[PDB]
Design a protein around this ligand. Structure first.
Ligand code: CL
Ligand code: CL
Ligand code: CU
Ligand code: CU
Lengths: 164, 164
């Protein structure tokens, strides 16, 4: 198998077939698919049953998680292209550097990554080292350091060495 | 290896970005995606708007068409796996020939393909020439000869020769 965004996020997020609380405490399933920010487990069960189209009882198959994963990766890509701040940054970046941005939008969302501003401007201006240093000072690095370290390596080197 | 089921159906079905009527007469779009059995263009446009999530106005993009195509191919595979007559034939076939069975299901549906009792039994028993002769005797061959010929050649030879 070769290297791509789908294989990148698979190593980062991992697979979980049952409803679990994430790093922020929100109910999630599959390959890091956020169900609800609501504190109720029942609220998450309704969102899951909606996304799958059957009574899941908080349990899904690997294939069912693959569908959500492919849908989330695609949603992240379209989200970047529809965001006025994210799209000019995206188009400038190369194939491998685009994947690193998708990873962040998969993890934090459209609005969350668009709030970086300075780091986004640095990547658009091709300043790879300056952006890498600035990303470590962010709240994203303090919360998930293992995750961010691999993404920062991808944005600075322009290669997928952090996964090889 | 650029040849597979997706490429096989791209050749057989073709790509159309405007609402068209199939061989049967029903409103279709993309790479053979059935919209409705209704003879209304207003009803089909509504079914296309609900499938995409925007005011399409009868026209879709190549990307939107690839989404519907991936959904239909997946649905065709599930149709085989959920069917008790289709699954043992599927599991006994090689990769190239599995694609020819998915092709038939994509085109006719799980129920219609299960009606080829004798031909399916011949495919399960590895009787390639006998299956080829019997499949040509069907209404499927009379209604759409050129597509059936290709699928038959694939089942007969176990190669991609009918396409490339
Ligand atoms: Cl997500
Ligand atoms: Cl038959
Ligand atoms: Cu898409
Ligand atoms: Cu599926």
């Amino acid at each position: 198998g070769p290297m791509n965004i789908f294989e990148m996020l698979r190593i980062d997020e991992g697979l979980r077939l049952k409803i679990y609380k994430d790093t922020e405490g929100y109910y999630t399933i599959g390959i890091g698919h956020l169900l609800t920010k609501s504190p109720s487990l029942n609220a998450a069960k309704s969102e899951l049953d909606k996304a799958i189209g059957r009574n899941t009882n908080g349990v899904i198959t690997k294939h069912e998680a693959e569908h959500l994963f492919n849908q989330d990766v695609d949603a992240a890509v379209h989200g970047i292209l529809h965001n006025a701040k994210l799209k000019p940054v995206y188009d400038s970046l190369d194939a491998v550097r685009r994947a690193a941005l998708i990873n962040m939008v998969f993890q934090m969302g459209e609005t969350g990554v668009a709030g970086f501003t300075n780091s986004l401007r640095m990547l658009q201006q091709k300043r790879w080292d300056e952006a890498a240093v600035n990303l470590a000072k962010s709240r994203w690095y303090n919360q998930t350091p293992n995750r961010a370290k691999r993404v920062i390596t991808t944005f600075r080197t322009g290669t997928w060495d952090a996964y090889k």
